[PDB]
Ligand binder design. Structure first.
Ligand SMILES: CCCCCCCC/C=C\CCCCCCCC(=O)OC[C@H](COP(=O)(O)OCC[N+](C)(C)C)OC(=O)CCCCCCC/C=C\CCCCCCCC
Ligand SMILES: CCCCCCCC/C=C\CCCCCCCC(=O)OC[C@H](COP(=O)(O)OCC[N+](C)(C)C)OC(=O)CCCCCCC/C=C\CCCCCCCC
Ligand SMILES: CCCCCCCC/C=C\CCCCCCCC(=O)OC[C@H](COP(=O)(O)OCC[N+](C)(C)C)OC(=O)CCCCCCC/C=C\CCCCCCCC
Ligand SMILES: N#Cc1ccccc1-c1cc(-c2ccccn2)cn(-c2ccccc2)c1=O
Lengths: 49, 49, 140
């Protein structure tokens, strides 16, 4: 989320290269997929014990 | 005489691939290779004739 | 009894029946070539051959996962023959390759016809090898 945020602000101040916005979208999506694996691991660790 | 004392067995927490367990692993291997089997035979039947 | 290895032999009778039909069509194509024709038997052959590899390439990964090491080993001489005709000698081509732009000049025409009867002789012996070890693994 912090990588995708600082690469979104570069995409707001230098829009001459547009690929800053799409790649920062990828870090915003790889972050949320790492929550889900984390929250499945977190909840399943409780239920096992 | 001499006997064995073990801890009384329990619910036995699941693994990662515990969802596969209603069918034996010999079934799942036959399912995967029948999947490529019917897909090749679909391809043979539809391309030629 | 029925098992996963017995199913790996059932599933390769069905696909070796396709492999012999690739080769009956492959001996007719070069016999009709000599009678007449280049550009069509370029295109008609070129579409056929890549199914013939990967079906046999399926058999390699199927008997590897079935733990059939004699059967995987008997598919090895046809396999490493197949890697040579696609990685080092599919001469230049670049449409698919191999039974492509390179026809007459007639020296590959003799090499293909020796191959075309060598494919059928292996596949007809593979069909009865697969039919035997099917009946073997079922009864035993
Ligand atoms: C065809 C395309 C669509 C599908 C794509 C598949 C991608 C996802 C697949 C797998 C990744 C998720 C899970 C990772 C597997 C390893 C982690 C693991 O813990 O597995 C353990 C397994 C055994 O599990 P068990 O039930 O007996 O647990 C026993 C526990 N007890 C003792 C309590 C009973 O043993 C093993 O390692 C088995 C060997 C692991 C083989 C999986 C390889 C994972 C590597 C990369 C994943 C892909 C990344 C994508 C970029
Ligand atoms: C991400 C993909 C899943 C990853 C596979 C997980 C396998 C490992 C899971 C838990 C670890 C315990 C495994 C240990 C028990 C068997 C030993 C083995 O060798 O471990 C692989 C087996 C192969 O099976 P086997 O019993 O014949 O080996 C018999 C081998 N001996 C004689 C040594 C027993 O387990 C298998 O991989 C059979 C399971 C095959 C899973 C694919 C089917 C899932 C999706 C199906 C839908 C799509 C297909 C149709 C469209
Ligand atoms: C849309 C469709 C769904 C796609 C899902 C695909 C996932 C499943 C696909 C293929 C299955 C992979 C694993 C199959 C295992 C074969 C088992 C078998 O029936 O054979 C028996 C032998 C004997 O087992 P063992 O004594 O060595 O184990 C002893 C275990 N212990 C260490 C506890 C003592 O098992 C062996 O190793 C045989 C030798 C090596 C076989 C495994 C190599 C995998 C080769 C090709 C598959 C690609 C994998 C991609 C993931
Ligand atoms: N419970 C559960 C469950 C939920 C969804 C998919 C599979 C399972 C499951 C099924 C089986 C099983 C086994 C034999 C016959 C039928 N089902 C076993 N397990 C399981 C539970 C605890 C530890 C290991 C496996 C399981 O977790």
């Amino acid at each position: 989320m912090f990588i995708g945020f600082i690469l979104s602000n570069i995409g707001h101040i230098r829009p001459h290269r547009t690929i800053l916005a799409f790649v920062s979208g990828i870090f915003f999506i790889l972050s949320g997929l790492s929550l889900v694996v984390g929250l499945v691991l977190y909840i399943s660790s409780i239920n096992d014990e | 005489g001499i006997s064995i004392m073990i801890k009384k067995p329990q619910k036995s927490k699941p693994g990662v691939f515990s969802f596969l367990d209603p069918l034996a692993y010999e079934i799942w291997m036959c399912i995967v290779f029948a999947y490529i089997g019917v897909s090749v035979v679909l391809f043979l039947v539809s391309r030629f004739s | 009894a029925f098992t996963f290895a017995a199913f790996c032999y059932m599933l390769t009778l069905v696909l070796c029946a396709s492999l012999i039909f690739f080769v009956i069509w492959h001996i007719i194509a070069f016999d009709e070539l000599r009678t007449d024709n280049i550009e069509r038997i370029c295109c008609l052959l070129r579409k056929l051959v890549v199914p013939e590899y990967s079906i046999h390439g399926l058999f390699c990964l199927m008997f590897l996962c079935a733990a059939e090491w004699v059967t995987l080993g008997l598919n090895i001489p046809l396999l490493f023959y197949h890697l040579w005709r696609y990685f080092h000698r599919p001469a230049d081509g670049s449409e698919v390759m191999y039974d492509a732009v390179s026809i007459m000049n007639a020296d590959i025409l003799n090499y293909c016809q020796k191959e075309s009867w060598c494919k059928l002789a292996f596949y007809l012996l593979s069909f009865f090898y697969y039919l035997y070890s099917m009946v073997y693994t079922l009864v035993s």
